[PDB]
Symmetry: D2
Subunit: 175 residues, 4 copies
């Protein structure tokens, strides 16, 4: 277990805002986007294709609670939540990431938004990967990966046992 | 081979307008609807869920050409085209039904709109089923069936080898 | 005051389902449609451009209550509500028609959906017009008219003091 | 006439990429967004409400041509064009800004996207305003201003003679 480092080499602090940015990519950061038409709640998570769009900010917090430290460590369960004043749709749902565990869940399930803090489908871990300050995300439903999704095939986040799909990311401190 | 009959028992005439109406259903007729977000062309085909919506009209014509008869027969290749003055999207494409044979085609492929008159993926046959004036549609990619689609799970037309999915229809003469 | 007659000459019954159909038109009936993008609630009301689309059904009821008669009369306050099992958006709002009296209300205000039974902006009257079984609708904000709206300029219902905009309708009994 | 300066005090260079960023605001930069539902082409221009969204990049070029200088000066006609590899809709139209001069043009007309290089409705000027490196944009249809538009009332660009609506901007060099 080590301190997760942001793209500047500084440790990632609990509750602080980060953009999650796919590594070795021409696209921007991770953002909410609908994966279904109607209903469109809950939203999925997508890499925007547009180069200078940094993503929607997230913050990390330990779950279950770990008291005493300000830093996020690898291989330890956290919640990931989008941080936005403006949120016009899907308001009956939270902004925590979670694996889709509904009855319509794909064999390789969507990462959606609206998980319950304590539910098991809401628990992620950050794990080191090769490259500087490059990481992967894992859940109890598999590694976080992408498939071409409904927005011009923009990467769409799923949980997957296929290593080829793994999403490698950096955390860019919101400045 | 027999004359296909409309819901009033009258033979179906080439080039005349019919609604295609799922049998034993509380929903309305078959209509264009997007199956993808962006791009949304080509459109797919859906049963509307709304009870009094009769569908968008279609017409049937023989392909290859059969000269001499005014009536549509079973077990004979036809094109099916939507008939609408108003058509605001997907205008570079035709209004003929076709099986999706693109590279992103699902294992059970979508019925889409925009087929070429002569292409093989544009050829349907009407086949008798049980019930009065009830029929099924077949293509060289399988029988026409539905799966719950993106519009509140409204039936979405596919080509399928699964008999459980078969869409049974009547043709209601546009009056 | 006279009994309002449907398109077959039969009196209009309280609580029964009617389509509202613009007279002397090539379009279909009146339907819910968004007049704003985001938020899209509350919905407005539009004439569909498509020829065989009959509209979404409505029912008429007296407000304030008139007890003893089964029939709708002219020049008497009623509510108009859309009647639909399926209603996927704007669910915190009712299906009663009402004049928009919000703070963003246009000088010629939109007819919207989601009025309170007793509120004054929810009160319509049916008034005779020329032509057989042709009527107009009025509210305390003006006569019901249309302007070209956001759906390919499809007639969009407003309340207006301009006689040129008046919407003439028939009521087609849902069969 | 002076050299227009970016947000770092450096002169603005012809053909280089800038974000246009409203001054004294909590929102992000200027972006394409639909102002009509259907058709949605041509697109309008909006300030995104989201704080860290920098805008879609633009570049400035003299029109009519001014040969010999690399810098953009005030009070001189230019074109403004969005610069994006990805452009999925409205492709029959250009990416140059222009005042809407169609027959449905509002009394205070929309700034749209898709102007012809030489047409007069495509000609902007940058003019100094108070504040450091703060500017306004003007056209022969009036000063560039905003009204609350259809995206949660996000500022929507118009041409206006009302000084209260003026949009004050800085140009942030795309890095
Ligand atoms: C209704 C829910 C909802 C939908 C549909 C979307 C959709 C999208 N978001 Mg998300 N979001 C949604 C909720 C929210 N988002 C965000 C915050 C963000 C941010 C910060 C960003 C996104 C972005 C995106 C886009 C990422 C895909 C891309 O690369 O395309 C790019 C493709 C285009 C730019 C072309 C135009 C897309 C256009 C905006 C929508 C086009 C609509 C279609 C024509 C509709 C078609 C209908 C079909 C069914 C017929 C995608 C358009 C990213 C983006 O790229 O935005 C520009 C982005 O940076 N979202 C928040 C917090 C405020 C939400 C709250 O609910
Ligand atoms: C952009 C392309 C396009 C899209 C998205 C649709 C979509 C639809 N068509 Mg089709 N059509 C489209 C092209 C065309 N249609 C038609 C002709 C028809 C007819 C005659 C009918 C349809 C109907 C339908 C609907 C059938 C599903 C249902 O049962 O839901 C019913 C669900 C509702 C009524 C709820 C509201 C739906 C609303 C109109 C759209 C909601 C938009 C979402 C909020 C957007 C969400 C964005 C996401 C990505 C975040 C569906 C909404 C049927 C229908 O039901 O219409 C009412 C119908 O009867 N279409 C023509 C010829 C003119 C087209 C030409 O291009
Ligand atoms: C999200 C809310 C909502 C929206 C956007 C609409 C929109 C519409 N309704 Mg309504 N409805 C909505 C709620 C509901 N409707 C209905 C019941 C009906 C009925 C019965 C009918 C309508 C129809 C219509 C259409 C009338 C205009 C027309 O003539 O165009 C016709 C234009 C087309 C057919 C072209 C394709 C339209 C397509 C379905 C939507 C296209 C989406 C755009 C690409 C999105 C663009 C995004 C922009 C911002 C970039 C319009 C598309 C009528 C219709 O024509 O449907 C086909 C119709 O008959 N509605 C119910 C009860 C179930 C609703 C419940 O919430
Ligand atoms: C279809 C055409 C089209 C539409 C509808 C839009 C729409 C939008 N663009 Mg634009 N764009 C479009 C074309 C393009 N855009 C861009 C590049 C960008 C950038 C870089 C950005 C935008 C952003 C925006 C948004 C600015 C408003 C805001 O503050 O809301 C914010 C509101 C939300 C985030 C909530 C969710 C919005 C969601 C993406 C769409 C929701 C759809 C509705 C549910 C549909 C409702 C249907 C109605 C009719 C019933 C708005 C959603 C900005 C943005 O904020 O994106 C996130 C932004 O940063 N656009 C390009 C170049 C690639 C385009 C090319 O065609």
């Amino acid at each position: 277990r080590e301190q997760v480092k942001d793209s500047n080499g500084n440790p990632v602090k609990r509750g602080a805002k980060y953009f999650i940015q796919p590594a070795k990519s021409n696209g921007g950061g991770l953002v909410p986007a609908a994966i279904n038409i109607l209903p469109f709640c809950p939203l999925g998570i997508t890499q925007t294709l547009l180069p200078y769009q940094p993503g929607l900010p997230v913050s990390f917090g330990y779950e279950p609670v770990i008291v005493g430290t300000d830093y996020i460590y690898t291989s330890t369960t956290i919640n990931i939540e989008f941080r936005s004043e403006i949120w016009p749709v899907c308001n009956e749902l939270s902004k925590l990431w979670a694996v889709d565990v509904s009855s319509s869940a794909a064999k390789e399930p969507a990462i959606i938004i609206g998980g319950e803090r304590t539910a098991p489908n809401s628990l992620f871990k950050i794990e080191e990967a090769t490259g500087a300050h490059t990481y992967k995300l894992t859940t109890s439903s598999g590694t976080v990966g992408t498939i071409p999704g409904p927005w011009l095939g923009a990467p769409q986040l799923i949980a997957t046992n296929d290593d080829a799909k793994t999403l490698f990311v950096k955390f860019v401190k919101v400045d």
